[PDB]
């Protein structure tokens, strides 16, 4: 188990490097703490129009202007 790795790394180093890179690529995104940042960067990109909602009377969370305090914030993106 231990001498096998040394022998196969002395004999075929290209395959050892390929399998190691593959294992890193397949186990690292599940372990890194920055994948959620990629998720909420991709979902916060404004491709299409933010269509407004008709004010019935009960939406305290929805802002009435872009500069209003309520609403989603991208300060985490500006700092990171």
């Amino acid at each position: 188990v231990a001498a096998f790795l040394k022998n196969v790394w002395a004999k075929e180093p290209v395959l050892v490097a390929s399998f190691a890179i593959a294992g890193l690529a397949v186990i690292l995104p599940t372990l890194s703490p920055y994948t959620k940042y990629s998720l909420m960067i991709n979902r916060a990109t404004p491709y299409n129009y933010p269509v407004p909602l008709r004010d019935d009377g009960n939406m305290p969370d929805v802002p009435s202007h872009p500069q209003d305090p309520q609403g989603p914030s991208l300060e985490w993106l500006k700092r990171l």
Binding site: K6, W9, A10, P13, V14, A17
Partner: protein, 176 residues
């Protein structure tokens, strides 16, 4: 008394193994060959500028054949036929007869420059230093028949190249 080329076992420790694997993955000896060919680019080339510069030669050089003369105008060949006897390619044809004053002189002396192997046996078998192999080598012709020398052509070559043939003989005759 003998040595063992290519009988070096490879070491199997981790240092040697990682060195060989890094040499495999990063192509070290290929960079070595590239770099040394680059170093050979920045050297002065060994090319001489022909025809303005000529390669070095020696007084023993064997080029075009010539017939010499004594320092009184009399030609040196006395028709002894040793040069045509020693010629390994049979390139020399000699015919002789006594001339008007009874001297033993050739009436025909042909050398086939397409048969001759330029071996210099004739100039060393001559007892009177009559036939020589001069220093000229740039005598390429456009026709086969221009390479079939008679007596007149060889005498003209001797009269043309005497001022160099005599100096080469003076430089070399103590080694013979």
């Amino acid at each position: 008394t003998y040595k063992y080329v290519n009988l070096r076992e490879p070491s199997m420790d981790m240092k040697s193994v990682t060195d060989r694997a890094a040499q495999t993955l990063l192509w070290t000896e290929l960079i070595r060959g590239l770099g040394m060919t680059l170093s050979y680019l920045f050297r002065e080339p060994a090319t001489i500028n022909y025809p303005f510069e000529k390669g070095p030669l020696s007084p023993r050089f064997r080029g075009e054949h010539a017939l010499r003369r004594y320092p009184s105008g009399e030609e040196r060949c006395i028709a002894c036929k040793l040069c045509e006897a020693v010629c390994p390619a049979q390139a020399i044809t000699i015919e002789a007869e006594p001339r008007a004053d009874g001297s033993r002189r050739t009436t025909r002396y042909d050398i086939d420059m397409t048969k001759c192997i330029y071996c210099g046996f004739c100039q060393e078998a001559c007892p009177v230093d009559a036939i020589v192999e001069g220093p000229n080598f740039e005598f390429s012709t456009e026709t086969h028949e221009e390479l079939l020398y008679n007596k007149e052509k060889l005498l003209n070559n001797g009269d043309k190249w005497e001022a160099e043939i005599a100096a080469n003989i003076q430089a070399d005759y103590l080694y013979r």
